[PDB]
Design a protein around this nucleic acid. Structure first.
Ligand SMILES: CCC[C@@H](C)[C@H]1CC[C@H]2[C@@H]3[C@H](O)C[C@@H]4C[C@H](O)CC[C@]4(C)[C@H]3C[C@H](O)[C@]12C
Ligand SMILES: [Mg+2]
Lengths: 603, 1316
RNA sequence: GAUGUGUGCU
DNA sequence: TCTGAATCTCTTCCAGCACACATCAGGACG
DNA sequence: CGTCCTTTCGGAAGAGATTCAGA
């Protein structure tokens, strides 16, 4: 290859070949000259070394270097390794009709839609635009259409909007760990440079929006388009292939919206009113005549398919909230009403989608998931469920618990000075009493958070589950846990040394009220342990999944029945305590080997 | 009292305890190290002097000739820094070393020299370091990153666990020299001590002991203590020491003087030992068969016949005793080999040892080191002599000797750089002691074992390598001496030194391209401590222990600023107060604590000098004299945090900032952030891009004014004075006469660096922050650099944030930005990129830059001038022609695809022998004009001063002042006056005036000749034309925005102004963030920053209200004082009564955007003080207001958190990442689409995506992926024709990369083929 | 065009 | 004194993606 | 220009290669 200038860029194979031919010609000249045996012997040894360096450089003791004191690439070094022909140009390769860009949300999309930039779809679908500018008579040759799409006339934007109509595009995220990392979406042309990606497929992609990018690929042939529509469409992948679990699960804002909407506060703008349907509930909430958390009696008609696939209606007068009745306008016909008549956390609506899938099928579930997403986003925006510094409520008993633990560790030190206890016993007792103190602080904080709200019930006074914002987004399963809310309002707890030994004095503070210069340095041990772990863990998991793919790569279900009377005896796994996995999970969806005998033995 | 750029906008400080030590110069390691390397140091401790004194005087093979070093000097650079960056050449200084060559006469080892000669010889042009710690290598700014490696010395490790698969721990003593070979010693599961030189292969350590001139009896004397048996009248009783019986079982009846002491089989207790010592009886009867398990120490030859009865180191038995007794050996010496304490390791090693004498050991060492050669006495002897015992190939440095002596409990730290027999034997003894059970191994990651090797030491080693190559060449040349004619320059070649120095500074693993996209990035790149590089470890083969943060990192290395991914914990960042010892170890300040008083004196304690003491924590409440409030305080004694009594401590941390680096100390409310979020915040703070207008952080830390000044971006006053002229591109300071030199007083001129390109293709641009006629002092900012505000670091913008979900547009981490943010152009950035066009003299004649371009229209050449280059200022777009170059037969430089901009500067370089183009000299004629504009101004000021002096002489002795100005200014010297020494001074001043004219002419001609230099280019080229396009990047959906607390996000929607939430005053919210991003990743720092920014902007709004409707200065002064006095007990304590009633108006005018607030790292504001400051405004104390929906006009049924957060625009733009490709160019050998965005390349459908397509069963999609839109050339154009044919169908073939594989396998001796 | 170095993002 | 089991050297690999720079035979005799 | 020339913070399988210690 000509480099920039009159010079020619180095090629390692050319250097090795010239090195071999040099010694070969010198040997021929020496053998024609009848040179003494030792000189031609050394020449033959040099030719042998040149050939060995040409074929497999480095298999000898010292690999020769062409320039920069680095071994040059031989013939055997471009067939093997990660940079060989196999793993770089044959098992995977760079691909035409493809692009990449940053992904944003676009929560207005449906499950089967992505949003392609208007300037990226004109470059991916360029030959398709040519084939219609040459078919509509808007151009006469390839040059005319090429210049027309070059200057981006106002007539190639409706040709593009027609090419793009029902032509799916694949959207891939770089660590394609499982097959859900490539899904096909129908494109929607948008103004911008970011690929808008539907919120419900982010869980499958394992893609937040903190700056990761996606790659669009364009299926060209009809078979490729029908594979993308019938196999890879995001509509067709609402169950994980690893287990029978759903993968279209609302997360962290749809579930906060549905949790805030479907909750009850024992007082409201209208709490004694009895409604005549979900539509009246929406009419009253939007007019500001009732609270979303009222306790009304709505007359609702729910359908059930206990017949032979036929839906029979039943109307009842149920004690619910205004929010739980507003949400009933999106639940399809066939589901019981006691699926929204509660406080919907993340698991509650994941189970709601799961039961919709098993009762009503796939198309009602795909329609239902978008409605859930829209009505969760709307009523999460309407709530204004913020977070402040007064939401992390420190217990009034935290100081007393910490002081008691200080007194107890002082007593243990007094016992150790007198020689009543050894070093290890002292350490274990201090660790145990500090763990007990941490548990007491956590329990006090969680109680003071969960049942904080005391509201007059239109009578004297009453308790209820709190509307603390951070507690709501921890309870709903939206974003939070018990350990994290404990580290925000309770105490951080016992921290470990890099080797693993626990430091005998815990972090007695928390992120709401500072951390010491030393308490913060102590935290960084376990903070960087868990970052170096995930940094070195990706390169170890990738190798494992590569070896697993290459072992098992070729099983394919080929026959339909082999007729065997062999099998394994699936039994529930019992380690000594609670059942780790019941028989139903271990035996579900599998063909039995022999007839199982009921305890009506011999039947 | 405050500085002059301090009573202009003084940041409120909420910090509570006083700083006894101010933050040092931030980039001090770089400057100190290079100053040490480049200085003229007597005694030759370090620098070029050390290398010259360690290589010179060099001599021949006793040929009566010697080249000796006299001195060295550094010539002035041929350019300055700015011209070196502009031209594209190194900012280097020639090295002129004065050597001397002396040759002796025949038969005169000490006699008179035949000829003695000396001269100054040029050897190499070593790059200099700029004032900011950087280097200019090839027109680009590079940084030599300091390295953290293992200090030379002896380290005793264990390698516990994974050896022998039995749970048996080994022990290894590794001696690491600064330059030389390694000397590992290690054990075996059978407890045999093996030596390993250069990690080659094991061989018994007694081999090297014999190679060190030791016999077997001497080795046993060294490593073991003798037990002596005596032949006597009966039973051969033994002299016994009762101490040696500590912890054994009585093999027989231990008795003395006929009195039984210990019964057989009983344990020898301490009571038995003490009663035996009380008896003080050493001679004890011993049974004859007991000695069967002993090993003889010294060889016993016969007395009569002289024959060896028993050799050294062999077992004994009754027959051996009988053979010794008939000879009559009254003395038997055996080895005390305790099974528990004093194990018999050297004895077993001698058993495994095959060698016998010194020569056998030397031959064995030669065979191990150099396999495949017939050994000889001289060859083996020379190899072992040059292995660890010659200064020419082995060197424990001063640090090596210091650590070596410290680890062996020696006293002197100085000594010889080479090993000795005593050192090796003591290393073996310490290893044996560790194996026995006494002593302990040392952890490698302890910061008392790892040095810091900065630029001044790394550059010396490469210069020393060049020097040894040069002296080898001279030694080759000095033997072929044609004397009486050889000057000391025909034997010196400056090619090796220049090559080594250029290779180190230009292409190395630690000579990195400078990260230059804000002051923080470069100020933290220079203070970077990398564990990688030459002589260090690697990312792939680094364990978890190097990754982790050691307890000795406190105060020496940041724990929360290290990149994620492949190298975390390998690229640590230096702490704020951290210093490098004289040896290289990291030391940190500590206030000395007397009996009860925390003194103000500070000691710089290193890592080993810290575990001895108990050091008080950084925040311990002393009361006005240094007495701790409690009797107990949290401290850290030996890498262990625990409580201690008040009287036990003896040191205290200087500041609460000393645990963190300079990047992590810019995060307000750091102590509330989880360390992962803090680490991400520090890194993304480094990645922030400079915006169009800098905006100070309302919630700062007080470290902004140090970072923005010490980084060198700002134009800072050198001598105080009065501003005389402020332009947009220059500042002139009339220096006070209190600071001017007596001779050539003059002024100071600061030429600001206007719109130019950084390494990251951003715009670094200085603009003045002073005004005309305004006093300044020394060291205060005159111009703000890129992303600084009034000499204060400003990486982003303060924007009104609301934490609420908004219809899913901030779903995962996304950010919903108002349209007012993009209307105000407050995140609009400027990106400058240079495009190059080189004219080379190819065949068929050279290529010229004429504008005569064929096969192009007039619209194509409309932008170019007649000279053939684009006009400065022409708004170009994608595909436009910038430079016109013609191919003799067209390689004109054209704008790449999709890049817009405006041409702001065109730059032409020409070699000698190319005449010019009119453009090429009409450019840099402006440089000539600019030089004249400074020289002429200085001339005018000096001439006016001289003529004023002339007139002031004229006012004495018949003053004639009315007639002075009537005549022209030339003749003002010979009017009516006296002929005293005043007239002599007048004549001297006329001579000085002629001298001034001549010297101005000569210096202007010098400037013109230096600017008009040839600036020699690369060979084969004629002229280089560089065109600088400047683009404005507006914020848009897709590019990352972050905070300082690790909360990054990608903008998902630019919402209109009327759609954003608004409060009861109608003010819309600038940014809407997701609340759910806070509880999970526990960064509570952003919420407290939001509240404190709300309080600060409330104060600013109050001041703006009092300034909008005009109010008297009394009310403004009262309110501003009430704002600055707010706090619990703060250290700031400003007083507005000392303000001049006009600089308080300027203060209030600078505070109307919001009063800045300092919140030091671990000494910050508290919620009580934040709420009090909110009350000082009119804002709710909870920090939450009631927002209204912008598009429905109704409340969000909750108070939401609204405040002001400091957002940063990270340098991950979306127009730099969006890419698409249908068809383009394809690679050469494998006909696949190219890679990257520059080349119109396609995305890589990798190996893992093929598995995802296989899992689906998408066989046709996969086939079209790997055949049609890829390698298969024949089926790739057919698909294009089908697609623009109305058809969607492929005729796939075989990928052309598989044929490449077949041909490459067939190019081996392998026949691979396809069957049928 | 190949390699190396380094940074960064996943 | 020939043989199976326990140590002794040398091979291979260690997730994916963009983007900056540097180096590409050049030293030297004719 | 034309043209010829010569070190060293790894962990498993496994394949030599030696030793051993036993009959
Ligand atoms: C008390 C004065 C200390 C001073 C005499 C000693 C103590 C440590 C020594 C330096 C280190 O060894 C590291 C380097 C070793 C190489 O040889 C190049 C020189 C190098 C900088 C040494 C120069 C000098 O020798 C030093 C500073
Ligand atoms: Mg992400």
């Amino acid at each position: 290859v000509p480099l920039d200038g009159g010079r020619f860029a180095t090629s390692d194979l050319n250097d090795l070949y010239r090195r071999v031919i040099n010694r070969n010609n010198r040997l021929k000249r020496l053998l024609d000259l009848a040179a003494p045996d030792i000189i031609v012997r050394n020449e033959k040894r040099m030719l042998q070394e040149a050939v060995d360096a040409l074929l497999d450089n480095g298999r000898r003791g010292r690999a020769i270097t062409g320039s920069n004191k680095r071994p040059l690439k031989s013939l055997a070094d471009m067939i093997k390794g990660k940079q060989g022909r196999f793993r770089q140009n044959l098992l995977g390769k760079r691909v035409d009709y493809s692009g990449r860009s940053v992904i944003t949300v676009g929560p207005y999309l449906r499950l089967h839609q992505c949003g392609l930039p208007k300037k990226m779809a004109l470059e991916l679908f360029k030959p398709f635009i040519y084939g219609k500018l040459e078919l509509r008579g808007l151009a006469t040759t390839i040059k005319a259409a090429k210049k027309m799409v070059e200057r981006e006339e106002a007539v190639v934007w409706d040709i593009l909007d027609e090419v793009i109509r029902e032509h799916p595009v694949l959207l891939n995220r770089a660590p394609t760990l499982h097959r859900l990392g490539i899904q096909a979406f129908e494109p929607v042309l948008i103004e911008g440079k970011a690929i808008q990606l539907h919120p419900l497929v982010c869980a499958a992609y394992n893609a937040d929006f903190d700056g990761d990018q996606m790659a669009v690929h364009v299926p060209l042939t009809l078979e490729a388009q029908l594979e993308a529509r019938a196999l890879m469409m995001s509509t067709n992948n609402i169950l994980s292939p690893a287990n029978g679990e759903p993968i279209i699960v609302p997360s962290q804002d749809v579930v906060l919206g549905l949790y805030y909407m479907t909750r009850d506060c024992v007082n409201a703008k209208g709490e004694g009113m009895v409604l005549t349907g979900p539509k009246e509930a929406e009419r009253l909430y939007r007019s500001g005549l009732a609270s979303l958390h009222a306790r009304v009696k709505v007359r609702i008609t729910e359908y059930e398919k206990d017949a032979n696939g036929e839906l029979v209606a039943k109307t009842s007068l149920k004690d619910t909230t205004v929010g739980r009745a507003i949400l009933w306008m999106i639940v399809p016909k066939g589901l019981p009403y006691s699926i929204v008549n509660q406080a919907l956390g993340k698991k509650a609506i994941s189970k709601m989608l799961n039961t919709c899938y098993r009762i009503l099928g796939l198309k009602p579930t795909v329609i239902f998931a978008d409605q859930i997403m829209y009505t969760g986003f709307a009523y999460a925006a309407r709530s204004g469920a913020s977070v402040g510094i007064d939401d992390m409520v420190i217990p009034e008993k935290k100081h007393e618990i910490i002081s008691e633990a200080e007194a107890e560790v002082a007593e243990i030190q007094e016992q150790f000075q007198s020689g009543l206890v050894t070093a290890g016993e002292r350490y274990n007792k201090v660790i145990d009493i500090w763990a007990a103190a941490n548990d007491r602080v956590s329990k006090a904080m969680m109680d003071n958070l969960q049942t904080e709200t005391v509201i007059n019930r239109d009578g004297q006074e009453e308790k209820q589950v709190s509307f603390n914002s951070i507690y709501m987004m921890a309870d709903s399963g939206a974003r939070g846990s018990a350990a994290q809310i404990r580290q925000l309002a309770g105490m951080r707890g016992l921290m470990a040394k890099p080797d693993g030994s626990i430091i005998e004095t815990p972090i007695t503070a928390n992120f709401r009220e500072g951390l010491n210069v030393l308490q913060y340095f102590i935290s960084t041990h376990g903070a960087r342990k868990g970052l170096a772990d995930t940094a070195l863990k990706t390169a170890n998991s990738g190798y494992l999944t590569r070896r697993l793919v290459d072992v098992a790569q070729d099983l394919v279900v080929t026959e339909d029945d082999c007729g065997t009377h062999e099998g394994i005896m699936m039994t529930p796994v019992i380690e000594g305590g609670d059942v780790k996995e019941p028989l139903r999970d271990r035996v579900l969806g599998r063909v039995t080997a022999e007839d199982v005998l009921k305890p009506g033995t011999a039947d | 009292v405050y500085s002059y750029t301090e009573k202009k906008r003084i940041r409120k400080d909420f910090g509570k305890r006083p700083q006894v030590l101010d933050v040092p110069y931030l980039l001090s390691i770089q400057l100190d190290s290079f100053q040490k390397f480049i200085e003229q140091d007597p005694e030759g401790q370090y620098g070029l002097e050390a290398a010259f004194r360690s290589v010179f005087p060099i001599q021949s093979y006793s040929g009566n000739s010697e080249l000796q070093y006299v001195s060295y000097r550094l010539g002035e650079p041929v350019f300055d820094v700015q011209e070196c960056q502009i031209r594209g050449v190194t900012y280097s200084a020639p090295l002129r070393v004065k050597l001397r060559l002396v040759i002796y006469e025949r038969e005169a080892p000490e006699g008179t020299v035949k000829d003695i000669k000396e001269q100054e010889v040029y050897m190499g042009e070593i790059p200099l370091m700029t004032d900011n710690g950087t280097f200019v290598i090839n027109g680009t700014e590079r940084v030599i990153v300091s390295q953290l490696h293992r200090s030379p010395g002896v380290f005793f490790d264990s390698d516990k666990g994974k050896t022998h698969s039995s749970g048996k721990v080994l022990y290894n003593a590794r001696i690491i020299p600064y330059r030389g070979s390694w000397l590992d010693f290690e054990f075996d599961p059978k407890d045999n001590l093996f030596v390993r030189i250069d990690r080659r292969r094991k061989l018994p350590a007694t081999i090297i002991l014999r190679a060190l001139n030791y016999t077997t009896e001497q080795i046993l004397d060294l490593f073991f203590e003798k037990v002596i048996f005596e032949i006597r009248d009966n039973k051969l009783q033994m002299e016994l020491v009762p101490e040696r019986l500590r912890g054994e079982t009585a093999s027989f009846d231990i008795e003395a003087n006929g009195k039984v002491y210990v019964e057989k089989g009983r344990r020898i207790t301490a009571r038995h030992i003490r009663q035996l010592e009380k008896d003080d009886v050493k001679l004890i009867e011993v049974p004859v068969e007991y000695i069967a398990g002993k090993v003889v120490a010294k060889d016993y030859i016969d007395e009569s016949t002289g024959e060896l009865i028993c050799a050294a180191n062999m077992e004994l038995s009754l027959d051996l005793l009988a053979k010794l007794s008939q000879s009559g050996h009254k003395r038997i010496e055996t080895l005390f080999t305790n099974d528990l304490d004093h194990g018999p390791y050297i004895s077993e090693t001698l058993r495994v040892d095959p060698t016998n004498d010194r020569l056998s050991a030397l031959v064995e060492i030669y065979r191990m080191m150099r396999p495949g050669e017939p050994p000889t006495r001289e060859a083996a002897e020379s190899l072992f002599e040059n292995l660890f015992f010659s200064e020419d190939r082995y060197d424990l440095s001063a640090v090596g000797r210091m650590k070596f002596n410290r680890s062996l409990l020696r006293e002197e730290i100085e000594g010889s750089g080479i090993l000795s027999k005593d050192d090796i034997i003591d290393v073996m003894k310490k290893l044996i002691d560790i194996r026995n059970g006494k002593g302990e191994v040392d952890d490698i990651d302890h910061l008392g074992n790892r040095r810091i090797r900065s630029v001044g030491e790394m550059a010396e080693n490469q210069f020393r390598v060049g020097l040894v190559r040069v002296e080898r060449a001279v030694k080759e040349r000095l033997s072929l001496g044609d004397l009486d004619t050889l000057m000391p320059q025909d034997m010196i070649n400056a090619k090796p030194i220049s090559a080594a120095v250029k290779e180190f500074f230009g292409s190395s693993q630690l000579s990195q391209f400078m990260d230059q996209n804000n002051p923080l990035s470069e100020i933290t790149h220079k203070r970077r401590i990398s564990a990688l590089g030459p002589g260090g470890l690697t990312r792939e083969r680094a364990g978890f222990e190097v990754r982790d943060v050691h307890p000795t990192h406190y105060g020496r290395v940041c724990p929360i600023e290290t990149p994620e991914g492949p190298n975390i914990g390998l690229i640590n960042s230096l702490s704020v107060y951290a210093q490098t010892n004289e040896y290289g170890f990291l030391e940190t300040p500590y206030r000395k604590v007397t009996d009860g008083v925390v003194t103000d004196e500070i000691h710089y304690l290193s890592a080993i000098e810290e575990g001895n003491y108990v050091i008080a924590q950084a925040n311990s409440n002393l009361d006005e004299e240094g007495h701790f409030v409690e009797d107990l305080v949290t401290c850290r004694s030996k890498g262990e945090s625990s409580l201690f009594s008040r009287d036990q401590v003896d040191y205290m941390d200087v500041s609460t900032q000393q645990v963190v680096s300079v990047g992590a100390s810019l995060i307000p409310f750091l102590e509330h952030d989880d360390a992962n979020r803090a680490l991400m915040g520090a890194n993304m703070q480094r990645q922030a891009v400079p915006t169009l207008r800098a905006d100070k952080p309302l919630v700062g830390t007080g470290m902004e004014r140090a970072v923005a000044v010490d980084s060198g971006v700002t134009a800072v006053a050198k001598r105080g004075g009065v501003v005389q002229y402020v332009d947009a591109s220059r500042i002139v300071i009339k220096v006070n006469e209190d600071e001017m030199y007596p001779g050539e007083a003059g002024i100071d001129i600061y030429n600001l660096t206007k719109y130019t390109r950084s390494n990251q293709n951003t715009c670094i641009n200085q603009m003045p922050c002073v005004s005309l006629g305004e006093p300044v002092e020394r060291g205060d900012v005159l111009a703000d650099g890129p992303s600084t505000d009034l000499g204060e670091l400003a990486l982003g913008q303060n924007m009104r944030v609301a934490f609420m979900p908004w219809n899913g547009y901030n779903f995962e981490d996304s950010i919903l930005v108002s349209e007012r943010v993009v209307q105000e152009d407050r995140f609009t950035t400027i990106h400058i990129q240079e495009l190059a066009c080189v004219s080379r003299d190819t065949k068929l004649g050279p290529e010229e830059i004429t504008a005569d371009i064929p096969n192009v229209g007039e619209a194509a050449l409309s932008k170019l001038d007649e000279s053939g280059i684009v006009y400065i200022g022409a708004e170009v777009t994608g595909g436009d022609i910038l430079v016109g170059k013609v191919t003799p037969k067209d390689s004109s430089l054209r704008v790449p695809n999709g890049v817009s901009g405006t041409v702001i500067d065109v730059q032409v370089f020409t070699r000698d022998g190319v005449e010019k183009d009119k453009r090429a000299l009409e450019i840099e004629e402006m440089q000539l004009k600019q030089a004249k504009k400074d020289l002429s101004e200085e001339l005018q000021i000096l001439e006016a001063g001289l003529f004023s002096r002339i007139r002031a002489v004229l006012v004495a002795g018949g003053v004639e002042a009315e007639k002075l100005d009537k005549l022209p200014r030339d003749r003002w010297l010979e009017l009516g006056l006296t002929d005293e020494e005043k007239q002599n001074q007048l004549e001297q001043l006329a001579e000085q005036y002629d001298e001034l004219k001549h010297e101005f002419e000569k210096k202007l001609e010098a400037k013109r000749r230096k600017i008009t230099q040839g600036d020699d280019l690369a060979p084969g080229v004629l002229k280089i034309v560089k065109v600088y396009l400047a683009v404005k990047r507006r914020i848009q959906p897709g590019d990352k925005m972050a905070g300082r607390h690790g909360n990054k996000g990608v903008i998902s929607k630019i919402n209109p102004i009327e759609d954003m939430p608004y409060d009861e005053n109608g003010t819309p919210v600038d940014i809407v963030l997701n609340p759910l991003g806070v509880p999970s990743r526990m960064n509570i720092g952003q919420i407290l920053e939001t509240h404190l920014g709300m309080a600060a902007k409330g104060i600013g709004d109050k001041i703006n209200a009092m300034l909008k409707q005009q109010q008297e200065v009394a009310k403004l002064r009262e309110f501003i004082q009430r704002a600055y006095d707010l706090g619990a007990d703060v250290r700031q304590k400003v007083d507005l009564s000392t303000f001049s009633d006009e600089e308080v108006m300027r203060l209030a005018e600078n505070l109307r955007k919001g009063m800045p607030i300092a919140t030091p790292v671990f000494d910050g504001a508290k919620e009580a003080e934040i709420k009090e400051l909110l009350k000082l405004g009119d804002l709710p104390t909870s920090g939450q207001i009631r927002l209204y929906d912008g598009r429905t006009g109704e409340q969000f049924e909750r108070p939401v958190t609204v405040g002001y957060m400091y957002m940063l625009k990270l340098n991950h733009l979306v127009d730099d990442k969006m890419h698409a490709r249908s068809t383009g160019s394809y690679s050469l050998v494998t006909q696949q689409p190219l890679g990257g965005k520059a080349q119109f390349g396609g995305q890589r459908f990798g190996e893992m995506e093929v598995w995802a397509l296989e899992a689906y069963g998408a066989a046709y999609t996969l086939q079209e992926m790997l055949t049609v839109k890829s390698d298969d050339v024949n089926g790739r154009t057919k698909m294009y024709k089908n697609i623009v044919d109305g058809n969607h169908q492929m005729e796939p073939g075989m990928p052309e990369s598989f044929n490449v594989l077949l041909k490459e396998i067939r190019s081996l001796g392998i026949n691979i083929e396809l069957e049928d």
